[PDB]
Design a protein around this ligand. Structure first.
Ligand SMILES: Nc1nc2c(c(=O)[nH]1)n(Cc1cc3cc(Cl)ccc3[nH]1)c[n+]2C/C=C\CP(=O)(O)O
Length: 176
């Protein structure tokens, strides 16, 4: 009936089905792809009415450190307490998906790879993944706009961790 409204990029929704008897990548599942506003909303409305983690990454980028577009990058991390799953999780996740498909970081949105939400009994987490941890100007601009877009209290920092550092964990490259 109507002409669909194209998004700037094509996106893929992935999920991680926690299965301890399998190696990490064997639990990744690519659910579906979309490149219009109407197809995004249909998928979002469908998931809402249905550690089982999810991610939205640009087409061609797998949601893993191993991917060529992620190996030299990192993520802005938002940590929620147990009480924030009910009051803030869904709002923070939708606002993060909108930053992605709407290219809310202007030219710096070209550095965005995707976003990951970790559903944990001990506390949920949401991250925006970027392609180059050494791109200080792009990384910091994305972080400041993301923190503001989510209405986070200014005094508390959010940290940007390089995937190389997260993978050899035993520390924040930038804070905003
Ligand atoms: N090899 C490897 N291991 C990883 C990775 C990774 O990219 N590669 N990741 C990052 C990652 C990508 C991703 C995608 C989805 Cl859909 C859901 C959750 C996700 N987590 C987290 N491990 C370790 C697992 C748990 C630690 P923790 O308790 O901190 O998640």
């Amino acid at each position: 009936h109507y002409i669909k409204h194209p998004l700037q990029n094509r996106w893929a929704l992935w999920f991680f089905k926690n299965d301890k008897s399998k190696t990490w990548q064997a639990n990744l599942r690519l659910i579906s792809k979309f490149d219009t506003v109407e197809d995004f909303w249909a998928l979002y409305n469908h998931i809402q009415l249905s550690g089982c983690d999810y991610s939205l990454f640009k087409d061609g980028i797998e949601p893993m450190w191993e991917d060529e577009k992620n190996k030299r990058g990192g993520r802005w991390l938002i940590t929620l307490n147990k009480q924030q799953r009910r009051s803030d999780l869904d709002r923070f996740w939708l606002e993060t998906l909108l930053c992605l498909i709407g290219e809310s970081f202007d030219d710096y949105s070209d550095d965005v790879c995707g976003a990951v939400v970790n559903v944990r009994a001990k506390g949920d987490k949401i991250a925006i993944w970027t392609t180059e941890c050494e791109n200080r100007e792009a990384v910091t601009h994305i972080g400041r706009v993301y923190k503001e877009r989510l209405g986070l209290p200014p005094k508390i920092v959010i940290g940007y961790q390089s995937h190389a550092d997260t993978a050899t964990k035993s520390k924040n490259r930038f804070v905003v």
